[PDB]
Amino acid sequence: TTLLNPYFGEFGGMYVPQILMPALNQLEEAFVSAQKDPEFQAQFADLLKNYAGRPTALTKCQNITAGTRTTLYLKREDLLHGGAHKTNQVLGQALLAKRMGKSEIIAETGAGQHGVASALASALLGLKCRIYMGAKDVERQSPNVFRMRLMGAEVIPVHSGSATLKDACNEALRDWSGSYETAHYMLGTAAGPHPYPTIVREFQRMIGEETKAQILDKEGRLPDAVIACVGGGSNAIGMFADFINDTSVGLIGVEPGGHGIETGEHGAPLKHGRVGIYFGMKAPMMQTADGQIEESYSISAGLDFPSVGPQHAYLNSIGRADYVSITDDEALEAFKTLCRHEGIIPALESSHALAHALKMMREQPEKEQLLVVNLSGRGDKDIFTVHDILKARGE
Amino acid sequence: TTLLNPYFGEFGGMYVPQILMPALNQLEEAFVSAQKDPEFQAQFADLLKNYAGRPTALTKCQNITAGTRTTLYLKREDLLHGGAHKTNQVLGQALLAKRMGKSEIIAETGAGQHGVASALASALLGLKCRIYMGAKDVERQSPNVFRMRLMGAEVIPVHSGSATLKDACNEALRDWSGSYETAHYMLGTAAGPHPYPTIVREFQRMIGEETKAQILDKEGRLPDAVIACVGGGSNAIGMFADFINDTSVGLIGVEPGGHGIETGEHGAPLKHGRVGIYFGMKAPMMQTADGQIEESYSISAGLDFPSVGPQHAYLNSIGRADYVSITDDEALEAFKTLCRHEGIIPALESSHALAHALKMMREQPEKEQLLVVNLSGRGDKDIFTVHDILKARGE
Amino acid sequence: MERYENLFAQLNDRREGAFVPFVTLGDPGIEQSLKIIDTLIDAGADALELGVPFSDPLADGPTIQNANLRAFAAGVTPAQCFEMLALIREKHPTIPIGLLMYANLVFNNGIDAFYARCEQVGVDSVLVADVPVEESAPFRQAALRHNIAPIFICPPNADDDLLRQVASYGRGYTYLLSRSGVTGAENRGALPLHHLIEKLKEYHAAPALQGFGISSPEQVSAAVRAGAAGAISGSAIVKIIEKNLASPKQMLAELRSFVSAMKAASRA
Amino acid sequence: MERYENLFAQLNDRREGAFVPFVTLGDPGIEQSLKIIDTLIDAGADALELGVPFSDPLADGPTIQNANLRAFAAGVTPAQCFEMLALIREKHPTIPIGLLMYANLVFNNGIDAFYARCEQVGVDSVLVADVPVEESAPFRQAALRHNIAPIFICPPNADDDLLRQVASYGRGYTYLLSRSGVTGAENRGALPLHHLIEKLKEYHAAPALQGFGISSPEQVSAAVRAGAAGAISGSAIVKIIEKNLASPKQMLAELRSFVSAMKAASRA
Numbered sequence A, B: 001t002t003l004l005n006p007y008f009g010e011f012g013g014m015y016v017p018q019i020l021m022p023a024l025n026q027l028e029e030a031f032v033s034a035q036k037d038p039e040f041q042a043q044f045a046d047l048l049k050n051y052a053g054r055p056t057a058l059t060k061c062q063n064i065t066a067g068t069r070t071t072l073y074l075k076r077e078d079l080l081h082g083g084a085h086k087t088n089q090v091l092g093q094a095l096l097a098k099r100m101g102k103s104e105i106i107a108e109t110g111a112g113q114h115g116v117a118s119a120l121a122s123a124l125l126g127l128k129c130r131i132y133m134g135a136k137d138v139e140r141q142s143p144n145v146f147r148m149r150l151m152g153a154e155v156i157p158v159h160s161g162s163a164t165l166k167d168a169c170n171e172a173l174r175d176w177s178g179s180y181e182t183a184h185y186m187l188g189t190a191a192g193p194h195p196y197p198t199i200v201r202e203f204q205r206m207i208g209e210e211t212k213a214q215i216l217d218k219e220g221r222l223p224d225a226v227i228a229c230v231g232g233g234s235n236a237i238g239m240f241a242d243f244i245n246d247t248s249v250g251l252i253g254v255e256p257g258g259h260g261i262e263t264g265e266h267g268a269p270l271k272h273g274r275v276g277i278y279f280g281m282k283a284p285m286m287q288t289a290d291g292q293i294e295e296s297y298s299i300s301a302g303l304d305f306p307s308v309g310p311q312h313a314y315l316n317s318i319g320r321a322d323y324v325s326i327t328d329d330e331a332l333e334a335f336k337t338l339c340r341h342e343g344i345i346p347a348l349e350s351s352h353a354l355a356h357a358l359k360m361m362r363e364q365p366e367k368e369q370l371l372v373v374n375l376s377g378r379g380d381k382d383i384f385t386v387h388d389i390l391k392a393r394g395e
Numbered sequence C, D: 001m002e003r004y005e006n007l008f009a010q011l012n013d014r015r016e017g018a019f020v021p022f023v024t025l026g027d028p029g030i031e032q033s034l035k036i037i038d039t040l041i042d043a044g045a046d047a048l049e050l051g052v053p054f055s056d057p058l059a060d061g062p063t064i065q066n067a068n069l070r071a072f073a074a075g076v077t078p079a080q081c082f083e084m085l086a087l088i089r090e091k092h093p094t095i096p097i098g099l100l101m102y103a104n105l106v107f108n109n110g111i112d113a114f115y116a117r118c119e120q121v122g123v124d125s126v127l128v129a130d131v132p133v134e135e136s137a138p139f140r141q142a143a144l145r146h147n148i149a150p151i152f153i154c155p156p157n158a159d160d161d162l163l164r165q166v167a168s169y170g171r172g173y174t175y176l177l178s179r180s181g182v183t184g185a186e187n188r189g190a191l192p193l194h195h196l197i198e199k200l201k202e203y204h205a206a207p208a209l210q211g212f213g214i215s216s217p218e219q220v221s222a223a224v225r226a227g228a229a230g231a232i233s234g235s236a237i238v239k240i241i242e243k244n245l246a247s248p249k250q251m252l253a254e255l256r257s258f259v260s261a262m263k264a265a266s267r268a
């Protein structure tokens, strides 16, 4: 039994070993209590403002939409301390960990932005942090490994499986199942067992709340659509949440298409997977005919995950949100375009969202549309990877 | 003849080849006009807010001062788009370049933060950017070289001399002396010939104006001191300016002590050099007995410059500001301390300011003092350098 | 069928506990796994717990992770696992056979169809490792419709509500977890918690088998002495397979010796 | 003394222009530099412009930057430059000698003391490259007190106010800049701007010598034809030194040949 609904339609639930149920129930009770606690809310608000730097800017692009009827704004989560939206909910979860008397933190990371967020919050609030990260990601997102370690976090490379996010998630959960008495599992996305999809949404929803206020101030109306990339679903649900009841506002989520959906080398389970049970949830996943979990692929480590959070699967099912895919090459073009024409170096994850917005504009250049892209992170972590690609393909 | 005073007491002036005087006079006239132009001020304010992310947070440190009577706040210029305070005045100077009908930008850079700022503003505002950078700095600040090039700037390594900031400055000025009809020289610090020290101060003074407002809001009184590192002087004069007439507020500038003042391997001309004429100004500089310009040294590329802006030399001369030095090792300790206890990775330049504030606390731990350190930039650019040091010295 | 019920009644009459080895089906290949299983039975196993290889086994430590990997390297699929199960049952008509499943393998082509396949090959119980009692309804319903015992876990910090649920919902045996964490021989658990054993009996639960970290005969004896009906050992058995991959004769000899000694300890 | 005044009166009587080479003092060493300078004079130089090596020569392109570096590699100091100057003057009593200085070398141990040292060794003029007329007061005052001509620059886009200042403040010769940019032979300037030449004469300025990018006899002729009193060539001369470092005999032969041809072009 739970205080809050663990399901979004068919999707969600608490598919963990029995040993972990009390920890999830404890977390849910602590969240419900904290959400009603003016002191907790004031502490969280103070950190978001004075430590992380909220509210983040909403930037109107004025070169990349020239000659079209698209107006495009970027919600600048790249400006948050740490360099990505991941910092918002880590500050909330760290405060929950302290509220529950935990002294240690376990986290998984792919892009290393959740790892960096977990490490910085742990240094600030006096928690001992260990971070699991796939060995492939340790290489391709190396700047973040250095940042995590300088902040005193233990970073544990995971060589198992695909040596990417799925495998880091597996190791984090294995660890927690033995260490939950002293350690909080700071899950890094709006996925996993209840109550994580709900908590992560509630601790990310300032993204859309601020966006709505800022777009009303600048344009006097709501956006025609908000667009966000989907790795596990946190930045997208953070942007979407405050708009769900504004029926006129399109909600577009962008999954990684990798080398192309037809290659099978992608990370787009919402539109190309099928429902399964893994990582504590019932959700769309990439799986073999026999029900083995498939390895995903994306150029971007933060999107390289074979499932998706259950609230996205639900929003899709009822038609409230639409989901699309963007390939590695489309993302790289959007990355280059933003660098050269707006002077903003976006994370490769965020480049997927931008690539789709650029397609919406280019495909129908006389369509009047007011769009917001959630620029979920900055691309400092990606510059060595992007350099090596653009060199090899001869630019 | 000029519209504004080119001198601060004995220091300053316009010591450039005659060919460049009309360009400096043109720049001064354009600045004076812009400072009275409500449209220009609105455009600059809009970019600072909606593109760069101002106001930047003022963060109270709550672990590093434990057990002392020091209260320490950090002014978070590390949160600005680009990752340093350099972005503020580049946005102002780029708008001036456009106002004067220039289509190209020349800049020097050491840390690469001014180079990054120049490149991003040029991508945004449609200018062609070339950046000079010493070959040593191209290596030790490599992340920023990658960032500048991805944004479409030409980065030109300078192998001459010490292959650091002085040499980049030399090449930028040589270039400008032949290209001033079409190119604006976006000088990156509060130094050089009039009107640059004045313009750079006026386009950085939001740092101190915001700091004053924020500290009044949080503490109901002014700081006992504000503390900033000094490479050429821009972040320090930006913090100091709005406090100069608040006679109770100490102004402390921190020069790089390198391997130790006694070694001669430092960058501390204000306190250890003597007055000379170089880089278009009369200012304290590191020089040989014969008047050759000495090579400076610092672990931090942004401080590795053998002179200093003339308004700092003046403030020192009258006793309004005090200047001190911090060595490489003291800066590295402050870097490590902030990472591990506050979850903020500071630029090595900014670490010099923090190191001095930590000394003010540690030396007199029962002295009641309210301090602000200008955290001028983030340390992403430095993480590979710091790693390699801490590894070699066996940690 | 009533294979667990019959086994526990026989063991009670003989005043002994059960010793139940775990192995991964198809590790290190189909033919060798079948021989390993025959050796386990010949050496005294009272019942079997058999793993179906799964891509992401999250209640398992490295020893059993690596068993799964060996089976996959041999091309083992769930379909081939059902063929093996049929062959085991055809040789051994009374031994209780339990499967260790991860939810997605059960849910994959339909829960009802999975349990129907189990019944047809003569499986007695299924433990779904990542389905807590809270999510168990469609699994336990399908299991009972097909005469399969659904197995539930009693963790060390089970409260009263959970003990009551596990007693009502489960059949065959109750899994008494030795400790938190994942499977592994080197991580030894607590002494079986008497209060849990006693409450499960008070609520008429299926008999308790203690598992996780049981790697020595002393731990088996301690479990039965504490009032558990028996003990399960996995990683300790799998370590003998892993050690002896190039020496199949030696593998079976060491498996026989270990299983015999573990069984002797159940007597108790 | 009145060495420039005497030279220009002699040149006017002969109806020819001046050709004035530039070299860096002490490049590639003290002894070789002295021989180079004697060769320049013997080949027809009317006056000399001589650079004191400086660590950061910001009006100079790579050719002259590298001359400065060679002199420093030979350990050349300003003190040694003054010893050289004394020796040159002792051999050549009437040739005008001008120094090319950067401000810090003049300002270093006192401006007045610098110009006093110049007078004692028999220097005729000093051009301080990074001191515009706007900052020139203490430099030109000290120069005049010690009978040294302060040299000022007339750039291509000089306005009327600047022309008047340069005419009033300067003595010896007026430096007519060919183009923007820094020193260098490959970057050829515009044809000497007639309007500047004519205005300087209207305001009774010291006679104009055109410089920057003058590397050919055709450019010397063009300067005199346009009404300038002569031309200065630096990088073209220094390139001959750089080319012939291992061949001192060949260096002097090529220097003689070039200087002779440049002088012939001034005739004009």
Ligand SMILES: Cc1ncc(COP(=O)(O)O)c(C/N=C(\CNc2ccccc2O)C(=O)O)c1O
Residues within 6 Å of the ligand: A083, A084, A085, A086, A108, A109, A110, A111, A112, A113, A114, A115, A165, A169, A187, A188, A189, A190, A191, A229, A230, A231, A232, A233, A234, A235, A236, A301, A302, A303, A305, A347, A349, A350, A376, A377, A378
């Ligand atoms: C800037 C940026 N933008 C978008 C994303 C996509 O993540 P989303 O916003 O949650 O959909 C990331 C993902 N980053 C991960 C993956 N984080 C992650 C992903 C999936 C499962 C577990 C995880 O910890 C990380 O660990 O840093 C990111 O860094």
Ligand SMILES: Cc1ncc(COP(=O)(O)O)c(C/N=C(\CNc2ccccc2O)C(=O)O)c1O
Residues within 6 Å of the ligand: B083, B084, B085, B086, B108, B109, B110, B111, B112, B113, B114, B115, B165, B169, B187, B188, B189, B190, B191, B229, B230, B231, B232, B233, B234, B235, B236, B301, B302, B303, B305, B347, B349, B350, B376, B377, B378
């Ligand atoms: C984060 C940070 N913090 C402080 C400093 C120190 O510079 P200050 O605030 O101007 O004193 C820098 C200096 N950075 C330089 C040097 N910039 C530079 C320095 C000296 C002469 C010319 C220059 O362009 C750069 O080019 O990025 C910096 O990046």
Ligand SMILES: O=P(O)(O)OCCNS(=O)(=O)c1ccc(OC(F)(F)F)cc1
Residues within 6 Å of the ligand: A017, A018, C022, C049, C050, C059, C060, C064, C100, C127, C128, C129, C130, C153, C175, C177, C182, C183, C184, C185, C211, C212, C213, C214, C215, C232, C233, C234, C235, C236
């Ligand atoms: O001896 P060890 O330490 O290898 O433990 C062997 C256990 N093998 S098993 O099939 O009983 C078994 C039983 C339950 C498991 O997970 C759950 F508890 F979450 F349900 C996992 C494996």
Ligand SMILES: O=P(O)(O)OCCNS(=O)(=O)c1ccc(OC(F)(F)F)cc1
Residues within 6 Å of the ligand: B017, B018, D022, D049, D050, D059, D060, D064, D100, D127, D128, D129, D130, D153, D175, D177, D182, D183, D184, D185, D211, D212, D213, D214, D215, D232, D233, D234, D235, D236
């Ligand atoms: O032939 P080039 O192109 O090498 O030019 C030679 C010039 N040598 S010089 O001493 O007259 C000379 C004169 C003025 C200079 O700078 C200033 F104009 F800013 F004052 C620099 C050098």
Ligand SMILES: [Cl-]
Residues within 6 Å of the ligand: A005
């Ligand atoms: Cl609901």
Ligand SMILES: [Cl-]
Residues within 6 Å of the ligand: A008, A009
């Ligand atoms: Cl819902």
Ligand SMILES: [Cl-]
Residues within 6 Å of the ligand: none
């Ligand atoms: Cl409902």
Ligand SMILES: [Cl-]
Residues within 6 Å of the ligand: A007, A009, A010
């Ligand atoms: Cl349901």
Ligand SMILES: [Cl-]
Residues within 6 Å of the ligand: A018, A019, A020, A022, C155, C156, C157, C158
């Ligand atoms: Cl428990």
Ligand SMILES: [Cl-]
Residues within 6 Å of the ligand: A259, A260, A327
């Ligand atoms: Cl494709």
Ligand SMILES: [Cl-]
Residues within 6 Å of the ligand: B005
């Ligand atoms: Cl003044």
Ligand SMILES: [Cl-]
Residues within 6 Å of the ligand: B008, B009
């Ligand atoms: Cl002043």
Ligand SMILES: [Cl-]
Residues within 6 Å of the ligand: none
């Ligand atoms: Cl005054």
Ligand SMILES: [Cl-]
Residues within 6 Å of the ligand: B007, B009, B010
């Ligand atoms: Cl003055």
Ligand SMILES: [Cl-]
Residues within 6 Å of the ligand: B018, B019, B020, B022, D155, D156, D157, D158
């Ligand atoms: Cl000019």
Ligand SMILES: [Cl-]
Residues within 6 Å of the ligand: B259, B260, B327
């Ligand atoms: Cl020291």
